[PDB]
Each structure stands twice: as C-alpha cells, then as structure tokens.
Design an enzyme around this catalytic site. Structure first.
Site, PDB file in Angstrom:
ATOM      1  N   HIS A   1       1.356   0.612   0.865  1.00 45.48           N
ATOM      2  CA  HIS A   1       1.726   0.747  -0.537  1.00 45.48           C
ATOM      3  C   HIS A   1       3.183   1.157  -0.715  1.00 45.48           C
ATOM      4  CE1 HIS A   1       2.229   5.082  -1.237  1.00 45.48           C
ATOM      5  NE2 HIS A   1       1.370   5.241  -0.247  1.00 45.48           N
TER       6      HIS A   1
ATOM      7  N   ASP B   1      -4.731   1.048   3.999  1.00 42.30           N
ATOM      8  CA  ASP B   1      -3.460   1.112   3.275  1.00 42.30           C
ATOM      9  C   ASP B   1      -2.355   1.495   4.251  1.00 42.30           C
ATOM     10  OD1 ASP B   1      -1.430   1.103   1.432  1.00 42.30           O
ATOM     11  OD2 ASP B   1      -2.193   2.759   0.216  1.00 42.30           O
TER      12      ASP B   1
ATOM     13  N   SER C   1       3.865  10.175   0.658  1.00 44.56           N
ATOM     14  CA  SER C   1       3.031   9.323   1.498  1.00 44.56           C
ATOM     15  C   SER C   1       3.761   8.975   2.787  1.00 44.56           C
ATOM     16  CB  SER C   1       2.641   8.044   0.757  1.00 44.56           C
ATOM     17  OG  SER C   1       2.120   8.325  -0.526  1.00 44.56           O
TER      18      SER C   1
END
Lengths: 41, 153, 153, 153
Positions: free
Chosen positions: C30, C52, C104
């Site tokens: 992402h 992801d 992230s």
C-alpha cells in the site's frame, strides 16, 4: 466540394485562431494575478 | 536568507536560481536548464511569455515552506543573497558592477524575513547598477520594471 | 538503534518504511512511491497482496546486513522507532493515538536487537491503540494480523 | 592532491575513477559506469580501444582544476591514493594484495602535483604485483603498459 472545404477551413481558422488569440489575452491577463497569491482580481 | 531558495543547473553548473513564493515556484524563462530538486522538476510550468518567467504550483508537501510575499516596498535598503539592495523611486539599485550573469532568479527580501522582488538582470546607471526585476503592485499585480538596456543575468 | 531500515520516498514524503529481513527487502504494498536507496530500488519486488506486502532478494552486496527475524514473541514490551510497544493477548498495543499514517513498514525490534514484526497500521477501541502487524507463528509460518476495524497507515 | 579526482558511479557504487588531464577527462573504457561529476558526465567520450580509454574536452569553467602532467619520471617514491607506489625498472609496484578491483583509473602523482600515469589494473603472477598503466613517453606519446597477466581492476 471546393466551397465546402473553404467553409470548413474558414471555420477552422475562426475557431482555433480566435480561440488562440482569446487564450493568449486571457492567459497573459491572468498571469499578472495568478502569480500574485494575495491580489484581489 | 537563501534557506528556502533553489538553484537551477545547466549541464552541471549554476546559471540561475528559482524561488518558491505563495506556494508556487518561479524561475526565469530564459534560464535554460533543469531545476535541481526532483519535486520541483515534476511541476508542469506555465510560461508568462512577456514576464520572461515560467511557474507552477509546487507539490503540496512544501506548501508550508513557501516564501510569503508583502506588497511593502518602502524606499531604502533590502537584503539580497549577494548583498543589500537599495530601492528608490521605482529603481532597485545595486553597487555598480557587483553581481552578474547566472544570478537571475535571485530573490530580494524584506527585513521582516519575506520576499519583495526577484532579479532577472540589470544594468549600471553610472551611480548604481539598476536591476531588471519583478515587483508586485500595491494591488499585488506583478509589475515588471527594467530600465532600458538592462542585460539579463 | 535501527539504521538498517529504509523509508520509501514518495514525492519526497516518508509515507512508509521498509526493512531488510533475512536478506529480502520487505515494504508494505500500500505504501506508494520509490524506496530511498537506489540499489534497493533496483530490486524487482514480488508482491503478496494477502499480506499487503511485497518481497524480493536484496542484491548480493548487503544481504549480510539484513535484520534477523524472530520467531519467539513472549508477552512483554518490544522496541520500536517511537520508543517501545507492549505486546498483549497476541497483539501489539500502543498508547492511544501515538503513531499513525506514514509509520507502515516500520519494524518492531526484539530487545536482543532482532525484528519480530513489521507494522501495517492500527486502530483504537477507545482505551488503547491496537496495531496491525505481519507475524510469524512459533512454527515459523509468516502471518498478517489486523485488529477489528484495522486502518492501514 | 586527490581533491581533483572523481569516482565513477556504477550501480551507485565506486567501481572506478576518472581523471581530467590538461583539460580533457580520461577513464578506462573497460570500466563500466556513470561519471560522478555532472559536468564530466556531459563530456562527449571519444574511444581509444587499443588504450582501453575514452576521453573528451571539459568546459572552461573547470579549466584550472584539470590535472597537470609530465613525462619526467625518475625511479623512487610516488604518491598514490593508497599512500604511495614504487616506480622502478619502468613499472609501478606496490605490496602484493593492496589496491585491487575498483581502483582502475586512479592517477599517480609527482609531488609537484603532476600526474605520471593512470592505473588500469593489477598483475600478480610470478615474483610480485606490478600495475598495468598508461604513461607518457619523453616525446609525449602515450604508452600503455600491461605486464603479462595484467588484469583490470
């Protein structure tokens, strides 16, 4: 056909050249303001 | 001073400068070459044919890091990357012969840490080197003043 | 200390991070944009959309520098970039609202100086922040964990 | 000394070096990669495959930083990137095992600041390590020395 193409060519000039002229004036009249972040147009 | 200014590079050498004001980046149009920072290079420029300038809205990251403008142009001294500049009666003045080619796009700053003008070149009046510059009106309109014969730096 | 870790530069923004674990570079899928290091960017990562995540062998010049992944995950406090985080009931839990978008891909460090997990984002029930993380079962099976209503960062 | 010497970027690593002598850049043809300096990268390389070199003129802004050169080369100590080399019996010598791959294109210098040769790679079979190099005859004409077993670094 010659007259029709003449009309088409004239219309092309009428549209694209007038649009170019108008765009030129609009662009160069905007830019003195678009460059100024606080100008009251 | 120059903390927020950006150099323009021609084939690996400096030949002008670009600066960010009001969240948009301005650079002289005659200054061939590529802006150093890739975020600025990604900007699609608009060409103000009669201003000898091209500009584009900077990426929204440095939106907080643009120079703020002020219309204030009281006659007197102003700060510059290469010195102090004196503005009088519509003329920005630099001590004769100092500065030169490759200095285009240099900003001029107010004592209140803000930009008032950008330099595009100039020429000597005799007593001072007058600069061809962009200077925005009382009503903010970006005026261009350039005494005759001013060479583009 | 965690200098063996590398964020992704998207439009000059650290919208995420990546870590070299077991000689494979891993970054969240992402997280749009290009990784900082040019040699790492030459790796054509292989994605695993169910996690992801995307992975790929780091080039032969730095696989020695990789972080060691950690199977064991006893309940307790684990090191991070934003200080340290508690691990409870099988989930990493963090002070309410600290950390967020852009974090992230930040690795979580075993106090011994090893990586136990990589964070995707989090959530809040109201009392505490619950993190979403990729994990490894005691057997060694790599897994992804996402609390109820997980938000990616 | 070395200040006026430049690396070659191959995969973002220093795989070689380039030198600019009398206003013209030279680097080995066998050594692949990108010249680090942007102005040097703009030079139009002209090949000399029998010399394993390519070269081209440099702009006047970087005229003075070019390496001066001469043919005079009595035997003795010569300064080098790895401190010094011994020039004797018409060849450059070093402790066997020093230097190696990556130092191709590194110049050797007279303590007057005059380059005497450029390194092309090592040779090690038999007695001791001798360095393959390009050199200048007393007439000025270039000579490329490659003792049998010479390999590029």
């Amino acid at each position: 056909v010659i007259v029709l193409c003449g009309v088409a060519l004239a219309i092309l000039v009428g549209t694209a050249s007038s649009a170019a002229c108008i765009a030129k004036a609009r662009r160069d009249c905007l830019t003195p303001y678009a460059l100024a972040p606080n100008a009251t147009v | 001073e120059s903390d927020k200014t950006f150099p323009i590079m021609l084939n690996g050498q400096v030949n002008g400068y670009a600066c960010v004001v009001g969240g948009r980046l301005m650079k002289p149009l005659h200054v061939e070459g590529k802006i150093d920072n890739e975020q600025l290079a990604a900007v699609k420029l608009k060409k103000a044919s009669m201003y000898d300038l091209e500009y584009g809205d900077v990426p929204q990251n440095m939106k907080s890091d643009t120079l703020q403008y002020t219309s204030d142009k009281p006659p007197g001294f102003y700060n510059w990357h290469h010195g102090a500049v004196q503005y009088e009666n519509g003329r920005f003045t630099v001590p004769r012969g100092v500065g030169g080619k490759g200095d285009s796009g240099r900003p001029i700053l107010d004592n209140r840490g803000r930009v008032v003008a950008i330099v595009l070149g100039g020429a000597n009046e005799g007593t001072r080197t007058a600069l061809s510059v962009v200077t925005w009106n009382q009503k903010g309109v970006t005026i261009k003043d350039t005494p005759e014969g001013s060479e583009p730096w």
